[PDB]
Design a protein around this ligand. Structure first.
Ligand code: SF4
Ligand code: SF4
Ligand code: F3S
Ligand SMILES: [Mg+2]
Lengths: 265, 533
């Protein structure tokens, strides 16, 4: 078979939910992605090597003359010279500073990597930043695939696009691909006719909630959130509003502070 | 034999950022340190916020044990406000949790643990027809020579490409003295590793049927759940079908592989033991009574299972003397504090971002071995039947459970038991709907001042979230997480934590490829984002 493109997958300040989302890949599934589509050359969650052997695997991939794609999960802690997060006794700041400028393409995957995420919420004790913010002085320009976690459809679609075209797709003003992030959740929502008719559930226990009325008065952030949730859904089967719960705005920068209280508008 | 230090950083095939340091003499570990090397500070971030928001933040403690912290925070705030949630909310929450256990443990055994035991490259030397006969002898599911050949051919193409990917620099490349399986057994396990990559998609989907999405569910609220669609026959049938397929994989693939591996590695009954166990119970009928749970809470000291002690939540204190926090005060979590102060590795005798929880001053293992052993000792009939069948098949006595092998076995036992119990909960839920109960959420009111606690027994053990509500806002919110118990550092009495203690005596055949350390560490299923938050 032809040589497969190298992927280096980094974990910074993260919960591993973004890694888990990639495992949910569907048509293609994750086995197809790592056996046929790509060469997954470093990934702390699943790789066989540990310790020094793992570090060596990372070095081998990064210095390949074929180049590599970096997929980055998690925010970069920058307070106190980066000491709140270390791997192999190097700060995550230092690791990303050395590796990411060498990548042929960088994908920041998840709201943490894109915008700083949960650890960057006030008062941000670790000085966590998204990739582009943290490494702007080094000219790193990551494609941002937001969400907490994102839809893995959006990661695989971006990778496939890059492999085909050797370029990023059209990006929005937050560096997110417009093919996935071009519409608000709300404008795609099945409950939109209720919003538009002023038909709001007043509580989760109400008959209006039972009948599927709009969740705006219960805090829904769909109107101010860009994502493809109602269209693609998750796990081939559901998404928050169809489970009766408001959108919390999880693909938006600083949503933890901008969209709270979550049960209010 | 090797004498000197071994450092494993990163420990891969866990959640989060762990550094293990050991001292080895004459080929055996004589000391160990568990160093967690990422801090986020979710407890600091929560201060002053709306208690209703807590579950959304705390769920992001961990996406491997997704849902569990949303459930713990919701139980915590439910408890603080004094709401008695409807029966269906308890059923739906319990069903989603049961599904989480199945997903988590399947992925752990195959995708995190098995590469410590399975030489995937040796599978290329196997006769697939012989491998299929072996597989068919250990499971009611018949495995064909042709299906194992398909796996082998795919692997051959992958290895021959020279791009080994996740197998680059594996400890098993070229063979390793501590890797014992024959080629046929390696092929069976490798085939099932690949099968599990697809099966886990279905196991996770089961959570999204009621819970919106996986990872990070979105269906819980203070007072109950939001998912009216979960009452429908269509959604229930969808969940049921996914559950049935998942259970079949547990019973017919995971458990037989676990037993074959355990039988080949019976020497691993001799390493990785611990003394004390704590568990919180799970799957309640009554949200205000831990002893209404399918598994019950309990505390055991010094392997004394004849004298199980009641769990007293006031006997938990989290130490910081060997952690990167200010001072040396051990605090109960309703008086918890999270005051970072980094000193570098071993600076001021500190080496981790985890606190060190102690129960009556003692280090406690939690997780599947604790839940299984304590439930067995309480007379739990399902746990006893499965545990006894496993011991009989392996030809070992109960003492074998106090080990790395035993812990790994207990994870499977719990998976099998919970897989069955999910069907019982599902039937009770259906029966409740059939009687006319279509309520899923109860009204409640925020007190200006209150304390609450929520308890979950998660896939890695006893999880507790603790809130102090002041002026209707979060005055304090503290998480004490299973991996904090198990993988936290020493306390101010210098007592080794369970993982540290378990590592003493581990043999190491090749210090450059220290798979023995990984076998024991991985048997605890570490989750460092959980442990530190
Ligand atoms: S974006 Fe969300 S799911 Fe992904 S690492 Fe961050 S907290 Fe976890
Ligand atoms: S439920 Fe949310 S996304 Fe849907 S119509 Fe209402 S406000 Fe918009
Ligand atoms: S919470 Fe996130 S997953 Fe979609 S529905 Fe809202 S952007
Ligand atoms: Mg804590």
């Amino acid at each position: 078979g032809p040589r497969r493109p190298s992927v280096v997958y980094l974990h910074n300040a993260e919960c591993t939910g973004c890694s888990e989302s990639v495992l949910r890949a569907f048509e293609p599934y994750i086995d197809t992605l790592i056996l046929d589509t790509l060469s997954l050359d470093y990934h702390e969650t699943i790789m066989a090597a540990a310790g020094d052997a793992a570090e060596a695997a990372l070095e081998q991939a990064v210095n390949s003359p074929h180049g590599f794609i970096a997929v980055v999960e998690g925010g970069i802690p920058t307070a106190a010279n980066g000491i709140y997060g270390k791997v192999a006794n190097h700060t995550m700041l230092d690791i990303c500073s050395r590796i990411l400028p060498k990548a042929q393409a960088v994908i920041a995957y998840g709201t943490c990597a894109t915008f700083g995420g949960v650890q960057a919420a006030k008062p941000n004790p670790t000085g966590a930043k998204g990739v582009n913010d943290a490494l702007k002085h080094l000219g790193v320009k990551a494609i941002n695939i937001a969400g907490c976690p994102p839809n893995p459809y959006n990661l695989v679609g971006t990778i496939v696009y890059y492999l085909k075209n050797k370029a990023a797709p059209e990006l929005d003003s937050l560096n997110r691909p417009t093919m996935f992030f071009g519409q608000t959740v709300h404008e795609q929502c099945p409950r939109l006719p209720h919003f538009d008719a002023g038909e709001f559930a007043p509580s989760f226990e109400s008959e209006e909630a039972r009948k599927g009325w709009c969740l705006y008065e219960l805090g829904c952030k769909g109107p101010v959130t860009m994502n493809n949730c109602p269209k693609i859904k998750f796990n081939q089967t559901n998404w928050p509003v169809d489970a009766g719960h408001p959108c919390i705005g999880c693909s938006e920068p600083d949503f933890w502070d901008a969209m709270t209280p979550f049960y209010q508008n | 034999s090797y004498s000197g230090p071994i450092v494993v950083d990163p420990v891969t095939r866990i959640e989060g950022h762990l550094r293990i340091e050991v001292e080895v003499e004459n080929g055996k570990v004589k000391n160990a340190y568990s160093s967690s090397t990422l801090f986020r500070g979710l407890e600091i971030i929560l201060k002053g916020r709306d208690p209703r928001d807590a579950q959304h933040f705390t769920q992001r403690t961990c996406g491997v044990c997704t849902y569990t912290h949303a459930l713990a925070s919701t139980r915590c705030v439910d408890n603080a406000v004094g709401v008695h949630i409807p029966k269906n909310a308890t059923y739906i929450r319990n069903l989603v949790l049961g599904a989480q256990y199945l997903h988590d443990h399947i992925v752990h055994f195959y995708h995190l643990h098995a590469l410590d035991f399975v030489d995937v490259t040796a599978a290329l030397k196997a006769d697939p027809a012989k491998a299929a006969k072996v597989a068919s002898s250990i499971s009611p599911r018949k495995t064909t020579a042709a299906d194992l050949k398909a796996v082998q051919d795919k692997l051959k193409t992958f290895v021959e490409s020279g791009q080994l990917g996740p197998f680059t620099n594996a400890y098993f490349l070229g063979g390793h003295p501590a890797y014992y399986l024959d080629p046929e057994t390696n092929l069976i396990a490798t085939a099932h590793y690949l099968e599990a990559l697809r099966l886990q998609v279905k196991a996770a989907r089961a959570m999204a049927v009621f819970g919106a999405k996986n990872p990070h569910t979105q269906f819980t609220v203070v007072g109950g759940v939001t998912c009216y669609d979960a009452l429908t026959p269509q959604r229930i049938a969808e969940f049921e079908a996914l559950w049935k397929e998942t259970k079949a994989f547990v019973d017919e693939v995971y458990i037989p592989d676990l037993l074959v591996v355990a039988a080949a590695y019976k020497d691993w009954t001799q390493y990785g033991g611990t003394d004390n166990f704590i568990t919180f119970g799970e799957f309640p009928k009554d949200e205000y009574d831990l002893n209404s749970r399918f598994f019950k809470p309990g505390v055991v000291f010094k392997r004394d299972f004849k004298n199980i002690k009641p769990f007293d939540k006031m006997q938990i204190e989290e130490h910081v003397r060997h952690s990167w926090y200010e001072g040396a005060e051990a605090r109960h979590p309703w008086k918890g504090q999270t005051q970072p102060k980094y000193t570098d590795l071993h600076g001021d005798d500190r080496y981790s971002w985890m606190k060190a929880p102690r129960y009556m001053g003692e280090p406690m293992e939690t997780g599947p071995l604790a839940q299984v052993l304590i439930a067995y000792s309480q007379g739990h009939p399902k746990v006893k039947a499965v545990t006894d069948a496993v011991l009989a098949k392996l030809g070992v006595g109960p003492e074998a459970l106090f080990s790395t092998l035993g812990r790994t076995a207990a994870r499977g036992i719990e998976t099998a038991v919970i897989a069955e119990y999910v069907g019982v909960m599902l039937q009770e839920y259906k029966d409740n709907i059939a009687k006319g109960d279509n309520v899923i959420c109860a009204p409640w009111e925020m007190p200006k001042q209150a304390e609450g606690v929520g308890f979950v027994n998660a896939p890695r053990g006893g999880l507790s979230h603790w809130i102090r509500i002041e002026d209707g806002k979060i005055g304090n919110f503290q998480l004490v997480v299973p991996s904090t118990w198990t993988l936290g550092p020493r306390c101010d009495k210098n007592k080794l934590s369970p993982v540290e203690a378990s590592l003493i005596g581990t043999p190491v055949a090749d210090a450059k490829r220290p798979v023995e350390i990984l076998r024991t560490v991985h048997s605890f299923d570490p989750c460092i984002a959980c442990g530190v938050h």
